[PDB]
Each structure stands twice: as structure tokens, then as C-alpha cells.
Amino acid sequence: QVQLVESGGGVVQPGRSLRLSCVGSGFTFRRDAKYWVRQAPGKGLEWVAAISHDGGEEDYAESVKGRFTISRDNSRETVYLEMNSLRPEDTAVYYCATTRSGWYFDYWGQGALVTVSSASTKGPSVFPLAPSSKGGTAALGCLVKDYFPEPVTVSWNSGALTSGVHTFPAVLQSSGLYSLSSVVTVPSSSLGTQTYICNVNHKPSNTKVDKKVEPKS
């Protein structure tokens, strides 16, 4: 089967460089052009770079020309993207792709995530979203604030509570740190007797927090 496998993603500081790699298998790598297409968080697809079958021709998007270099090594069935002078707006998932005729992106890799930021790794503070305790439905949650980089995971009661949970996408603050909330709806009659604990894990910082959330005095 046609397969493309990317590697080399990560967190990089603005102005620095990163090289992405994409290895093909299951087809004749040298026959056709190769491409990189990226998707910034929450945005659409943007073609970045193209290289002809034998590397004799390279094309780039205007946003990326001069700073990025596409290259290939057909003897290793690999195509590369060398990303220099990285800018915050280069943060995206980068997909490698291959073509049959040059018109279209017939096959796609799995993506490599590139995050461009001057923020330092930092685990979150976890604050309670305490239930009001005032249909008999209450809401409670955890505010997972000021962490970098993504991702964080949140469970409730160590996985024993899944119904009614909503863990929201993180927002990026102007500080460069992320914040997100995780909430759950539960019966208000349970608030005095049932313990609710959010389990937060931020693996990049080796930060794990279990926060019990209860009605405030």
C-alpha cells in the first residue's frame, strides 16, 4: 500500500530551524513530484512547497520562499522540508504528499506538528470551577491554566466518570501559555455525597494533578 511517514516535528523557538522528513513506501518514490501542505490550528489547508521527480525543479508559496527549502533523496525514498527563520505563523501540522500527474495530492502522510514559540515548558495550575449547588443539574469543572506546550489530558474520577464531560480546546493567551477548561454536568442532589476529582496530566513537564472539586463554603 502507498504510505508516507513524516518525522521531525516539535517545538522550536522563533528564528531557529527545523527539518522535516517524509519516507515513502509501497510505490516508486522517484517517479513523481513530492509536496508539503500545512494546516495552522483551526485553519484550512495551505500548499507550501513542491519538488519535481528528480529534484530539478522546486516551487514555493510566497509566504515561505527563501526561508524554506524542499529537497529529496530518492535513494532513501525520502523528501525533506528545511524550515529556517521560523515565525509564529509557521505553527501548523505539515503534511507530505505525492502525486500521479502533478495536478493533485493523491496520497498524504500523517502530519508532523510544528510549534513556533518562545515560551518555556511549564506545567499548569489547576483551579476548581466549583458547582453552584443552588431540573436538578449542576455543573463543575477544572480550569487548567498557563501551560506550555500542548497537550494536556483531563479525566474525571480516574476514568470512572465519562458521561457529561466536556473538555474544551485550549486557547492560546497573549502570554504565550495555553489555558483550557474541563467541565462535567452531574445531578445537584449528588453534590453533598459524591466526590468529583479532575485528573490533569501535562506530560511535557511531567506534571500530574488530581483536584477534588466541591461546593465552596
Binding site: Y35, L45, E46, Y95, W103, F105, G141, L143, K145, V183
Partner: protein, 214 residues
């Protein structure tokens, strides 16, 4: 030189129903048009190329048509995985590949008003000099919703951020969190914190509030 426009940007349709998506090119691209599907959390895949040809292995429910500037993608019966984002694509002048901005196909359902909850900052957070006030809009449909923050009746603009979940796998609703950020010093200068929500399911806006300290 060539712009692809996908409109409408969101289609709300029922499971098992027919869908037709539109791509319009600003000038003719003849039949050199492709469509991609991006399923939730997955890479894009090619569905249709040369306007009407199905890529190898693609299910027979996908079809396409058009020539010149007006193109369509048809899904004869929407399967669960087809609630996805679809992009059209063209290539001009041999060296420029461009995409439309995408159309999201979402699950249509009956209108549901949000249940609304407001959360004060915790005392623990206030120790560090910042206050986060959170408003939750739970399990609503359709997606369009407006949150307005007020602090002692002063409308807040510019100092909040919102996030929305993907459509729920069981009830096809959305939920939304809005966080108002203030300094501790400012938080302690005011009494009434309110989140006002406007939604098609509400006959009039709903406000949830608290009085600091009470």
C-alpha cells in the same frame, strides 16, 4: 490569480441524507479540480479529481461534476464519517496549488437551548494576582451563540476568550466555554459579574450572575 470559493461554509444535514457541496472558481479551471475529505483528527484524503473521477478505493457514494467555474461534490447518503470538512483544490500556472476555505458538514438536529453556568475565580487563583471568570454554555444547537460579559453593568470587550467542543457523538450538540480575564485588583473593585447568552433556542437572552463575596 485563481480563487476557489466554497459556500456555504457549513452544511447541516441529517444522517443518511444526500449532500451537495459547492466550489466556485473565480475564472475557468476547465475540469482540473479535486476534492479532499478531512475526517475528524485525520489527514486529508483525495476523494474526486478531474472534477468527476473517483480516487482509487473511495466509496461509490462520492461523486462530482462540473466544468469551468462551477463544481459540485455529491454524497448520496451521509455515513457517520462523512460529517467532516471538505476542501476543493486547483493548480494554476504550473507552480501554484490552492484550496478553497473548506465546507464543514455537520449533523442537523432540533434546536436546543444552552444550559448556562457562571463560575467565580477561585480563592487559590486570586492569591496569584489574576482572576478568571468562566461562563459555560452546555449542550446547545445550532452552533451560533453570543456571550456578553458585564461587570457592574459595564459591557466587557477584548478581555475574554472562547472555545467550543466538537459536535457531541450522542446528542449532536455543542458546548462553549468563555473565560473573562481580569486583574485581582480590578476583580475586587466590582460586585456584579454576569454572562448574558443569546441563542435561537432562547426566547430572550439568559443572564447568569454572581455578586463577589456573597
Amino acid at each position: 490569480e485563481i480563487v476557489l470559493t466554497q459556500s456555504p461554509a457549513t452544511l447541516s444535514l441529517s444522517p443518511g441524507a444526500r449532500a451537495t457541496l459547492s466550489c466556485r472558481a473565480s475564472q475557468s479551471v476547465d475540469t482540473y479540480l479535486a476534492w479532499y475529505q478531512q475526517r475528524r483528527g485525520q489527514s486529508p484524503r483525495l476523494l474526486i479529481y478531474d472534477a468527476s473521477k473517483r480516487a482509487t478505493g473511495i466509496p461509490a457514494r462520492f461523486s462530482g461534476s462540473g466544468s469551468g467555474t462551477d463544481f459540485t461534490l455529491t454524497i448520496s447518503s451521509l455515513e457517520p464519517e462523512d460529517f467532516a470538512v471538505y476542501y476543493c483544490q486547483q493548480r494554476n500556472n504550473w507552480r501554484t496549488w490552492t484550496f478553497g476555505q473548506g465546507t464543514k458538514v455537520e449533523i442537523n438536529r432540533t434546536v436546543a437551548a444552552p444550559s448556562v453556568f457562571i463560575f467565580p475565580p477561585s480563592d487559590e487563583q486570586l492569591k496569584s494576582g489574576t482572576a478568571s471568570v468562566v461562563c459555560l454554555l452546555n449542550n446547545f444547537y445550532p452552533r451560533e451563540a453570543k456571550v456578553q460579559w458585564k461587570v457592574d453593568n459595564a459591557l466587557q470587550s477584548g478581555n475574554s476568550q472562547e472555545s467550543v467542543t466538537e459536535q457531541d457523538s450522542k446528542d449532536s450538540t455543542y458546548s462553549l466555554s468563555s473565560t473573562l480575564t481580569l486583574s485581582k485588583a480590578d476583580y475586587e473593585k466590582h460586585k456584579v459579574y454576569a454572562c448574558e447568552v443569546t441563542h435561537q433556542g432562547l426566547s430572550s437572552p439568559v443572564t447568569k450572575s454572581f455578586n463577589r463575596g456573597e
